[PDB]
Amino acid sequence: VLTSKKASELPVSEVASILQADLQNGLNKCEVSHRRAFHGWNEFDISPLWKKYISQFKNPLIMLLLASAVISVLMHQFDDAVSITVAILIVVTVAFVQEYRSEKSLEELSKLVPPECHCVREGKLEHTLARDLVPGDTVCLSVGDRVPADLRLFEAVDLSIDESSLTGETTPCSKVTAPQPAASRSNIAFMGTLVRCGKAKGVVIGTGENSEFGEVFKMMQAEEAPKTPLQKSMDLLGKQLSFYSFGIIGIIMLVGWLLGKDILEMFTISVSLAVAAIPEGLPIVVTVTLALGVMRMVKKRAIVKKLPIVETLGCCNVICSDKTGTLTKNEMTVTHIFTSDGLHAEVTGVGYNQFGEVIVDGDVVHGFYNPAVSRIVEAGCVCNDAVIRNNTLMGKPTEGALIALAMKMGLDGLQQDYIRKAEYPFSSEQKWMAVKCVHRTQQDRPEICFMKGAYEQVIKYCTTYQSKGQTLTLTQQQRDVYQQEKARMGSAGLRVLALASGPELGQLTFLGLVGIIDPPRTGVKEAVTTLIASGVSIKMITGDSQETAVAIASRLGLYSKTSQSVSGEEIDAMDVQQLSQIVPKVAVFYRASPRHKMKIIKSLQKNGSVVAMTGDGVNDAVALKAADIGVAMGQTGTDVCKEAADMILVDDDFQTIMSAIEEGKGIYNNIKNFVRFQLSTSIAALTLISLATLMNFPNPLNAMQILWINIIMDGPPAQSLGVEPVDKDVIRKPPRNWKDSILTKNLILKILVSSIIIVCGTLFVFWRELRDNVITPRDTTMTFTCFVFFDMFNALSSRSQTKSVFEIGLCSNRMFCYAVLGSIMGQLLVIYFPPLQKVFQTESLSILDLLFLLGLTSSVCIVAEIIKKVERSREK
C-alpha cells in the first residue's frame, strides 16, 4: 500500500509498479487473493449493547421513576422500590428488544444493498463489491459514483468529484491525471467522495483502515441519532401529564394530611400514585411503534435510513417524481433519427449493444453510406463521456444510447479519433453539452465542435444547418419543420436530443434529431392508481419536453384528459404565491431545472403538505434532500441519490411508497391507543384516591396495589396496545395532518367515560362491602380486583377507537392476550397466594365474588362498544 501524498508525488507508472498494478487489464484472481490474504478486506474493522441499555435510561421519566424508588429506599419500603424497579426493567427491556431487532433487520437490508463499483480485473469490467477491493486493482469511475477506495487516477477525460463529505466544501473538485509534485491532491480520488461529472480509471492505493480520511467515517458511524420530533413531542406530553399528576397528588397529600391520616401511608400512596400516573411507557411505546414500522418497511423492502421518516410517511400527501430513472426504467434506446434535410432513419434493436441495423427508406445504412445520418451519429458518439465496456454502460443512459447507436452504425471508433482539448460539460441548467475536438490524423483540421442537448438550446446555438451535404444559413421554415418533428416525436413517447457540429460555439450546423425511447417502468401505473385512490397526489417534475413528459404521464395515468402541465420557465416567471395556488392543479412539470424542482418542492411545502420527492441523477440530490422524504431507487440508482435519500426501495417498486405511508399512518393510531388506555386508568385511580381522601373513606388501594396497577397500565398490557396491528379503514383514510394533536376531543371524551365508569363501579363495590362498617381485608381485595378487572376491560376496549371489540377479535393481538393472561394470573396470585396476601394486604375471595366483579367490570366494554356502534351508524 502507499500513502496518498506519496502516490500524488510519484508518477503513475511508479505507482503501478509498487502495487504491481496492470492499468489496462487489472489484477487476476490469484493476484487479488494474495493481496486479500496480506491486506484484507476493505471494511472499517468492526463497528455496544450495554451502551444502548444504559442509554435507554436517559429518558427523563425513567429518571423520575428512579428518583421515586430512591425516595422509597430512603424511608425504607423495600417492596415499593422493588416494584418500581421491575416496572423500569420491563419497559426498558421491551424498548431494547424492539430497537435491537429493528436495527439488526435494517443492517441485514443494508447488506442486501451493498456498496459496489466497476472494477476491471481479468481485462473485463465487472460490478465488484467495494468491500472486495484489494490495493493495486483497477477501478473505473462513472458519473454519480461513490469512490470505492482511495484511488490513483490514471485516466481522467473529464472529472468533477465533490468533497463535502470529506473536506467540507460543497464545490466539486476537478481531477487531472497528471502527477502532482510536492485535500489538495488534484490527482488522487479519495475514499467516500462522489463523482459529479465525467469518466475515470484509477488504481487503488489503500484498502481497509489504510484510507487517509477513514476517521470522518469512524465519527459518522458513531454520530448517534438525535431524538425524533414525535419522540420530543411525546416526551413533552409525558412531562405535561407527569406535572399535572404531580399537582393533583400534592393536593391530595395536603388534603389527606389536613383531614387527618397516617403520614407514612399518605407518603407511600403519593409515591405509588406518582409512579403510576407518570407515562413511563409513553416514550417506550413511541420507540416500539417506530421500530415496528421500520421492520414493517424492511419486510416491504425499503431501507429506512432515517428514523424521522417513519412517522413523516404517514403525513405524506404529495409525491413529486422524476420521469427518467423513477417513472421510466432508464433503459434508453435511440430508435428514430430525423435528419435535418427530412430523411427518416429507423434504428432497430434494443439495449446498449451494437446489435440492430439502421434502416433508411427500407435500406440498411452502414458506415458513411448516408453522410448526414453518419454525421448525427458521429456527433452523438464523440460528445459522450459514457462507455459500453463488455456490454455494460458506465455513464448516463442517454449518452449510452448514442454510444450504442454509433456502435450499431459501425462508427464507434470516432470517439478515439478526436482529442478533446476543451469540454463544455452538461449541466441541467445548460440543457446542452459540447466538446472541442481535432482529428488525430488530420491535425490540420480545425477545432470542430460537437453539440447535443435539448432542441431549444441546440437550435439557439446553431446559425447554419445542413442540406444534401451543403452548409446553408438557418431558415425559420426549417426551424418550424424541426419543431413539428420534435413535438411529434415527443408525443409518441420518444425522448428527443438535437445535435449540432461546427467551427466554434454559436456557429454550429444543425444535423438533426434522435428519438430516445424510454419505456415507463412496469408497475408504476397500478401503484399510481392506488396512490391517487388513497388520497395521495402524484406529480411529475421533469427536465424533458412537454410532449415526452405528457405522453409518459398519460400512459402512466397521472395525466387525465383534462389536466394541466406547466413548463419550468413559467414557474420561474410566476411568484412563489402564484405557484402555490397553481401547483396542486398541475400534474406534469416539464423543462424544470433542479432550481425549479426545488422551487416546486418548496411551494408544495408552503401549502401545508409533506412532499416525498423520488429522485435519480447527480443533480437531483439537492431536491431529494430538500424534500420531506427523499426516496431513491436501490437497483437502478446512482450512489449520489442513495446517499442523500431517506428511504431506498430495494426492489424498485412504487407500491413500497404506499406501504411506507400505511405503516406511518398506523403508528399514530397505536400511540393513541396507549395514550387513551393509560390516561383513562390513571385518571380512574387518581380520582379514586382523591374521592377517598375528600370523603374520609378508607383508601380503596394501598401503595403496592397502585404499583401493581402501574405495572399493568404502563407495562406489557399497555405496550401491547402499541404493538396492535393496523386496520384497513384507517389505511384508505386521507393523509394524517403533520401536526401531532394526539389528544383529541373525542379521545378525551372516551377517556373520561371510561374513567367515570371505572370509578363508579369500583366505588360501588367498595361501598357494598363497606356497608357493614368493618374494614376487612376482603373489602380492599374486592376493590383492588374490581380496579384490575376494570383495567383489563379498558384494555380490551382500548385496542381500536372505531372498530368494535368483536370485529377486531381477541386472537388478533398475541402480545395483548399474553399480557392480559399474565395480569389476570398475577391478580389471582395477589388474591390467593398467602405471601402475596401478606405483602399486598389482601384476603382470598369466593368464586361468586369474582363472577360478580367480572360482570360489573364489563361495563366499560359494553359502553365503549355502544359508543363505537353509535359513531359507526352515525357515520353510515
Partner: nanobody
C-alpha cells in the same frame, strides 16, 4: 395486433441440444428485425441471436459459434438451437420482433412472455 408465444423451454444438460420456438400470429414478411434476448438477475438483458432485413444474422460475441437461428413463414415461428451450453450462460429468454414504420413515431416492438432455463454445474 400480433401475438408472440414462446415454447420449447425446459431442463437440458450441458453438451446437449436445446430447442426454442417463438411463434407470431401474423405473417412474418414485413418484420425487419427479430431476435432473442437473455435476461439474468443482477444484470441487464443481453442479445442472444437474431435476423435482420437484409438476410444478415446477428450473434452475440460471447455466444457466437454456438447458438443458431432459423425462420420459416410456413409455421410463422422463429426457431433457435442451443448447442454445447454451459451452466454459466443460462437465464430467461425473451423473443422480440420489431417492425418498420412514418408519421407515427411509436415503435412497433413486440415482446414475448419469456421462458426460464436454469442449468446447474
Amino acid at each position: 395486433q400480433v401475438q408472440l408465444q414462446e415454447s420449447g423451454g425446459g431442463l437440458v444438460q450441458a453438451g446437449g441440444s436445446l430447442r426454442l420456438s417463438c411463434a407470431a400470429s401474423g405473417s412474418i414478411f414485413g418484420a425487419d428485425w427479430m431476435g432473442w434476448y437473455r435476461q439474468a438477475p443482477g444484470k441487464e438483458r443481453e442479445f442472444v441471436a437474431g435476423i435482420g432485413h437484409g438476410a444478415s444474422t446477428y450473434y452475440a460475441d460471447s455466444v457466437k459459434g454456438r447458438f443458431t437461428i432459423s425462420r420459416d413463414n410456413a409455421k410463422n415461428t422463429v426457431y433457435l438451437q442451443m448447442n454445447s451450453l454451459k451452466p454459466e450462460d443460462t437465464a430467461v429468454y425473451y423473443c422480440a420482433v420489431q417492425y418498420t414504420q412514418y408519421r407515427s413515431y411509436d415503435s412497433l416492438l413486440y415482446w414475448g412472455q419469456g421462458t426460464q432455463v436454469t442449468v446447474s454445474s
